Design a binder for this molecule. Structure first.
Ligand code: NA
Ligand code: NA
Ligand code: NA
Ligand code: NA
Lengths: 211, 211
């Protein structure tokens, strides 16, 4: 959840908002080790329920999100249902566990390509065009992360948009991401320079991946 | 409906058959002028019912077809329900009236393209990839006619088969068609040659479109 003033500003200028619970357990092995564990349910619930209680009156918030990159646990299913019950006014989405689990109203893959399948074991990323038409699937598809803009990037961006326009059920996506996460450091003359991971003696690190 | 020996031979050699009733009114304006008219229902029914009564025991017959190119009329709807009622063992298909009407179990267009939309009024031929994921659609798609093999033809044939393999609900189609409809004429010195429309004094004619 963002600084409270952000929602105000989005109400007034006009932007659609995905409001997301503070839940990400990426580094667990496997990814759902905590979110499938009922002993971590109360801790998780407070991060979803308190977001809904604070933010439920802003018109700019149109979709609720259960977090990100935490696999798919039974805690997600319970919390998905909690939201659908106290606030029917907004769809709920969540990406973990293959983008199309029983915990999401919207097929929300990350980095799924337009025409090319990436058939990973257990959690494949199908081409988005193919994904809509998988036997028995009916939901809309909106990428929660796509077109990773790291460095000299964004090649093939046109290809997504040609598809978004041609397919009614392909309803677009959220580019990753807005602003470089670099920090300021100074030399011996007082000149500032932009820094990434590693530049503070911080280790282990992931270098330029923060930009 | 074919020569009765055809079905026996398909049973024994192993071929899937689409048995099709003797109804085509392509030349009416509009195409469904008779098939929507209740006074032509008796003549139509006899052509569907007498087919099902004759061929219903052949295992090679897997699909029933209501005819071809007669637009979409209420008589197609009645006769569709008649078949489903007397023989639940087999799906019923019909291409006329846009290829996805209430008178077909299978989306079965003729000459719809792989990637390219052809948005004709009322009877659009969508790209087969797009057609599957239209809002509310769930049916399998098999082209009743595709890859028109007239003269030096069959360009772009690989593009269909690449799509057939990648998309589960795209399940193939039937090439148009098997054999050239030319006839033998003889000249002054008694040598045979292959003839097409017009070559008999026949007028009006459609020249080589029979090949
Ligand atoms: Na769209
Ligand atoms: Na990053
Ligand atoms: Na297929
Ligand atoms: Na022809």
């Amino acid at each position: 959840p963002n600084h409270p003033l952000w929602y105000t500003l989005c109400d007034r200028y006009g932007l659609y908002v995905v409001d997301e619970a503070n839940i990400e357990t990426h580094g667990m092995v496997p990814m759902n080790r905590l979110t499938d564990d009922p002993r971590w349910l109360p801790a998780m619930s407070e991060r979803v329920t308190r977001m809904v209680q604070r933010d439920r009156n802003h018109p700019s918030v149109i979709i609720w999100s259960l977090g990100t990159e935490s696999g798919h646990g039974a805690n997600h299913d319970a919390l998905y249902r909690w939201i659908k019950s106290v606030d029917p006014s907004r769809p709920v989405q969540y990406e973990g566990g293959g983008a199309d689990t029983t915990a999401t109203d919207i097929i929300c893959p990350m980095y799924a390509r337009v025409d090319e399948d990436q058939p990973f074991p257990a959690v494949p990323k199908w081409s988005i065009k193919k994904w809509l038409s998988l036997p028995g699937e009916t939901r809309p598809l909106i990428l929660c992360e796509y077109a990773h803009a790291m460095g000299n990037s964004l090649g093939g961006f046109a290809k997504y948009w040609q598809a978004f326009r041609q397919y009614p059920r392909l309803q677009g996506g959220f580019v990753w991401d807005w602003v470089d996460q670099s920090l300021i450091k100074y030399d011996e003359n007082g000149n500032p320079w932009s820094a990434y991971g590693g530049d503070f003696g911080d280790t282990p690190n992931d270098r330029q991946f923060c930009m």
